[PDB]
Amino acid sequence: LYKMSSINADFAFNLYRRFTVETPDKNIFFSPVSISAALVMLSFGACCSTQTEIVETLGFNLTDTPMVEIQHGFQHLICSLNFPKKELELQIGNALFIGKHLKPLAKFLNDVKTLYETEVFSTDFSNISAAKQEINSHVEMQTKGKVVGLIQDLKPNTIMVLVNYIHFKAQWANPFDPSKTEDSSSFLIDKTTTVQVPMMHQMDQYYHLVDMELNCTVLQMDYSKNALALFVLPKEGQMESVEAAMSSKTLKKWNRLLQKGWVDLFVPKFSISATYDLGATLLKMGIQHAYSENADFSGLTEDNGLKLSNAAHKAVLHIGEKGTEAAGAMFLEAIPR
Amino acid sequence: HPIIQIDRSFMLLILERSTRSILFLGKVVNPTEA
Ligand SMILES: O=C(N[C@@H](Cc1cc(I)c(Oc2cc(I)c(O)c(I)c2)c(I)c1)C(=O)O)c1ccc2c(c1)C1(OC2=O)c2ccc(O)cc2Oc2cc(O)ccc21
Ligand SMILES: [Ca+2]
Numbered sequence A: 001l002y003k004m005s006s007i008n009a010d011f012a013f014n015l016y017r018r019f020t021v022e023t024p025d026k027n028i029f030f031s032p033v034s035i036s037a038a039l040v041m042l043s044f045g046a047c048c049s050t051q052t053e054i055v056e057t058l059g060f061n062l063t064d065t066p067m068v069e070i071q072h073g074f075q076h077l078i079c080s081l082n083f084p085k086k087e088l089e090l091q092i093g094n095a096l097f098i099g100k101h102l103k104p105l106a107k108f109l110n111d112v113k114t115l116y117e118t119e120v121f122s123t124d125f126s127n128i129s130a131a132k133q134e135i136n137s138h139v140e141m142q143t144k145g146k147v148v149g150l151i152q153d154l155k156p157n158t159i160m161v162l163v164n165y166i167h168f169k170a171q172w173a174n175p176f177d178p179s180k181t182e183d184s185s186s187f188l189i190d191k192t193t194t195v196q197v198p199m200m201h202q203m204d205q206y207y208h209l210v211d212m213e214l215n216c217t218v219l220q221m222d223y224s225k226n227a228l229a230l231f232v233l234p235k236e237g238q239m240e241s242v243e244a245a246m247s248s249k250t251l252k253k254w255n256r257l258l259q260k261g262w263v264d265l266f267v268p269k270f271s272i273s274a275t276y277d278l279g280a281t282l283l284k285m286g287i288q289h290a291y292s293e294n295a296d297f298s299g300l301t302e303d304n305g306l307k308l309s310n311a312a313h314k315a316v317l318h319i320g321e322k323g324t325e326a327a328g329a330m331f332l333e334a335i336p337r
Numbered sequence B: 001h002p003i004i005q006i007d008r009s010f011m012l013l014i015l016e017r018s019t020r021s022i023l024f025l026g027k028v029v030n031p032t033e034a
C-alpha cells in the first residue's frame, strides 16, 4: 500500500544522506528502488536474524508490516512498475547468476521467477573473467546500453551474483524548444566557480512552490504519462539544511502545497553518472549477519552454502529538451559461507 | 511571471505516480563532470 511507499522514500533519503557524507559536495545519483528491490530479493532466501536485519535496514518495522506483507508489497511494486503504460518506458527486473555447483532450492527459484521478474542463469564461476563479462553485458542490454561495466572486480571465489536493473525513458509533458536553448550559460558549482552548460528555456504553467520553512524552491515537471520530476533548488547556502529535512513527510507536505502557475523556467541540459561501493555502507546501516560465517540463507540453498561479500550500484541520467533517460543497476556478490 | 533559474546546485527526484515510488534521487553539483 502507501505504508510501504513512505518507508521506501525514507530509506532513499537516509541513504542519500549517507552519500552526502561519503562523497561531500559531489554529484549524487542513484536508484533507491533498485537498491531496495535487490536487498528484498536477497531477503526472500534469508531466515531469522539475517532476514530481519535486511528488512529493518530497509526501514521496515516487523510489528507494523510482517515479513510476509513486506514480501507481498515488493512483489506488487515490481509488477505495477512494469505494467505497460503508453509513452513511458519503464522496466525493472532481476537476474540471478547461480554457480553451477550450488544447490538452490526449487522454492527460491520458482518464486523469484514467477513473483519477482527474475531470470536465472547457471553460471560457470570457474571462469571468473568470462562470468564478469557475461553479467556486465546482460546489464548493459537490459538497460538499453546505458549501464556499462557495472562489475569492475569480481572476487575469485564468487559463487552467486544477484543483479537488479532499472531503465526509464520518458518525454516531458511540455518539451523544450531547442531553438530557445542557450549553448553556453553559467552554472554555479561553488561560491566562486561557474561551469558552462546548455540552458533550456520555456515559459509554461508548472506546479511549483517556495517552501517557507526550508527556504527552497520546488518545481515539478511532468512526464507525459505516470511519472514526474521534482527539482529542489535551495537558497544559496541552504543545501545542507534542505538535505537534512528531506523525508516522506516533506514530500507529502509538498504534494499538498504545489500549485500550477506561469513560470519563466531555465533548466540545464546535461548528463551525469555515479557509482557506489555499498558493502561497508550496508554493514554500517545494519546488515551484519548476511556477511558473516553464520549467515542464514537457508531459504536459498539446500546446504546454506553462501554469504554476502560485496555490493555495488551504478546509475546514469540524461536530461534534454525532449525528456529524460535514466538507468541503474545493483550488484550483490556471494562467496562460500 | 516568476523566474526559476536552475543555475546552481539542486536536488532531483524522479517519481512514479501509481506506486508513489522514488525511481531516482540525486544532487547535481556540477552538471559537466566526467
Ligand atoms: O498535487 C498533485 N500532485 C501530483 C504530483 C506528485 C507530487 C509528489 I511531492 C509526489 O511524491 C509523493 C507524494 C506523496 I502524497 C507521497 O506520500 C510520497 I512517499 C511521494 C508524487 I508520487 C506526485 C500527484 O499525482 O500526487 C496533483 C497534480 C495534478 C493532478 C493530481 C495531483 C491528481 O490529478 C491531477 O491532474 C492525481 C493524479 C494522479 C494520481 O495518482 C493522484 C492524483 O491525485 C489527485 C487528487 C485530487 O483530489 C485531484 C487531482 C489529483
Ligand atoms: Ca525499459
Ligand SMILES: [Ca+2]
Pocket: A099, A100, A101, A123, A124, A125, A126, A159
Ligand atoms: Ca561455479
Ligand SMILES: [Ca+2]
Pocket: A104, A105, A106, A107, A302
Ligand atoms: Ca531442492
Ligand SMILES: [Ca+2]
Pocket: A121, A138
Ligand atoms: Ca545469457
Ligand SMILES: [Ca+2]
Pocket: A186, A187, A188, A194, B007
Ligand atoms: Ca551564475
Ligand SMILES: [Ca+2]
Pocket: A203, A204
Ligand atoms: Ca504554452
Ligand SMILES: [Ca+2]
Pocket: A298, A302, A303, A304
Ligand atoms: Ca543447512
